[PDB]
Amino acid sequence: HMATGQDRVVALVDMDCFFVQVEQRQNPHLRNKPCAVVQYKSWKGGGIIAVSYEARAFGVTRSKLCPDLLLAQVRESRGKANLTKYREASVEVMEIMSRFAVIERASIDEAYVDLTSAVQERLQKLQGQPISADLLPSTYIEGLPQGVQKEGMRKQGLFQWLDSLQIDNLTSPDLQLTVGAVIVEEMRAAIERETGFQCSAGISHNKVLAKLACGLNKPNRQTLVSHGSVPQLFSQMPIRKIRSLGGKLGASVIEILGIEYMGELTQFTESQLQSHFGEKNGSWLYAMCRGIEHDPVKPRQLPKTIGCSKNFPGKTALATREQVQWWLLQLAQELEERLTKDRNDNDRVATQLVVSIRVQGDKRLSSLRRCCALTRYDAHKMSHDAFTVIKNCNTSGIQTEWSPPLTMLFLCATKFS
DNA sequence: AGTGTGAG
DNA sequence: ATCTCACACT
Numbered sequence: 563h564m565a566t567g568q569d570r571v572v573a574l575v576d577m578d579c580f581f582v583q584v585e586q587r588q589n590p591h592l593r594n595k596p597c598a599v600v601q602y603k604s605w606k607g608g609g610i611i612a613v614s615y616e617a618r619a620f621g622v623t624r625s626k627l628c629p630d631l632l633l634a635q636v637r638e639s640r641g642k643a644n645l646t647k648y649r650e651a652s653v654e655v656m657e658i659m660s661r662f663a664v665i666e667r668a669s670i671d672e673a674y675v676d677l678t679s680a681v682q683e684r685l686q687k688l689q690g691q692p693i694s695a696d697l698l699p700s701t702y703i704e705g706l707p708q709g710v711q712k713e714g715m716r717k718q719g720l721f722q723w724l725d726s727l728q729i730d731n732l733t734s735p736d737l738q739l740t741v742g743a744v745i746v747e748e749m750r751a752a753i754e755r756e757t758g759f760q761c762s763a764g765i766s767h768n769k770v771l772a773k774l775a776c777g778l779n780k781p782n783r784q785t786l787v788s789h790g791s792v793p794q795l796f797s798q799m800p801i802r803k804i805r806s807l808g809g810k811l812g813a814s815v816i817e818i819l820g821i822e823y824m825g826e827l828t829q830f831t832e833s834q835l836q837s838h839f840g841e842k843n844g845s846w847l848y849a850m851c852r853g854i855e856h857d858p859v860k861p862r863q864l865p866k867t868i869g870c871s872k873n874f875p876g877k878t879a880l881a882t883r884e885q886v887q888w889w890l891l892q893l894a895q896e897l898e899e900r901l902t903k904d905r906n907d908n909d910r911v912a913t914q915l916v917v918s919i920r921v922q923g924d925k926r927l928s929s930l931r932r933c934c935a936l937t938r939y940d941a942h943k944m945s946h947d948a949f950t951v952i953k954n955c956n957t958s959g960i961q962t963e964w965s966p967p968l969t970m971l972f973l974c975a976t977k978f979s
Numbered sequence: 980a981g982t983g984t985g986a987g
Numbered sequence: 988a989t990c991t992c993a994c995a996c997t
């Protein structure tokens with residue numbers, strides 16, 4: 563149950579090269595041939611952001627060497643990418659997924675699912691008899707097939723898993739996970755049938771393990787990670803690959819303890835971890851290296867902030883007053899469009915406008931931030947309000963010159979009510 | 980409460 | 988992602 567962190571059934575669904583698939587649905591000639599999606603940029607034909615798996619075999623990567631490669635491009639608006647098409651496809655899939663169990667949309671192409679309830683309901687409604695392997699055509703059970711080889715090995719491991727599953731104990735963690743994988747198999751089948759899109763999934767007891775499991779067998783495949791498989795999986799799992807350990811905390815763990823893999827954290831005591839990383843982080847690390855994590859999947863859905871920004875690196879850095887005013891207006895117009903849709907869809911209005919900037923030479927993400935009331939959904943008014951609070955923040959008193967220059971402009975609406 | 984951190 | 992959004996922290 564909770565002592566061993568097997569209290570829930572969590573899944574992570576991530577679309578395989580989502581943007582590529584969205585383009586392939588519109589232009590058929592691109593569906594089963596190596597292609598990519600570019601943003602029109604005069605350097606190299608434009609930067610690549612989404613690459614199909616077919617092209618990855620040739621060594622093609624995102625951010626040329628596959629002459630057959632076909633290209634599709636993102637519409638551009640106000641100097642940045644326009645992702646409306648993708649947001650609409652994301653919403654489509656999310657609505658389809660919400661039918662099988664409640665979800666937490668985590669990004670434009672992936673979402674967590676809490677199947678605990680659905681798994682309980684499914685074991686009851688089920689006769690109570692066994693689960694045939696035919697319900698898991700694309701499920702991999704991690705670590706088991708120990709002791710054409712791609713396919714089939716999966717089926718042997720699946721057979722050993724099913725042959726060792728509890729039959730009578732309906733609260734058996736492994737059984738709950740197996741049923742969760744069945745439900746995910748159905749969910750993905752429905753998604754493909756109704757949209758044509760393929761995706762991958764991870765099934766485990768918490769968000770961290772579900773996210774890690776999803777990437778174990780991509781694409782169009784799903785992986786089940788049991789509590790018993792956690793030690794082996796962590797034995798050579800880079801610390802920085804765990805959700806929330808990708809930044810300074812993870813690097814700090816590596817440097818202070820002189821370790822690289824998650825499983826090595828098992829050798830330290832809870833008191834040791836608290837004495838080196840603090841009470842909260844020490845306990846979190848102690849349980850996570852053992853496969854235990856409790857972050858709940860939250861259906862809550864309306865956003866707490868709505869905003870947009872744009873970066874101007876190096877040469878492009880905003881130098882004149884005219885430039886900063888124009889880009890603030892562009893940002894406020896995009897903001898107005900989105901806030902308008904927000905108010906139409908959720909009957910709420912933003913009461914605060916946050917303005918943030920970054921000056922060339924500053925290592926921090928943002929050089930400063932100020933705020934002001936957001937009374938009217940007027941791009942022109944908002945542009946002047948943001949400009950007014952940030953305008954005195956300039957060193958050059960020389961006219962027609964902004965000093966220091968700006969390398970980033972950010973506008974954000976919050977405090978909804 | 981604004982700053983800093985982290986995911987995707 | 989070579990942008991949007993969440994939230995922990997005296």
Ligand SMILES: Cc1cn([C@H]2C[C@H](O)[C@@H](COP(=O)(O)NP(=O)(O)OP(=O)(O)O)O2)c(=O)[nH]c1=O
Nearest residue numbers: 576577578579580581582611612671780987988
């Ligand atoms: C990580 C990342 C994603 N994206 C965009 C393009 C992807 O289609 C979209 C989905 O992000 P992802 O889930 O991280 N990667 P993917 O879905 O495209 O590919 P896959 O899951 O590894 O097969 O986000 C970038 O433009 N730059 C990036 O660095």
Ligand SMILES: [Cl-]
Nearest residue numbers: 916918931974
């Ligand atoms: Cl903010």
Ligand SMILES: [Mg+2]
Nearest residue numbers: 576577578579
């Ligand atoms: Mg993906």
Ligand code: NI
Nearest residue numbers: 942943945946
């Ligand atoms: Ni004006």
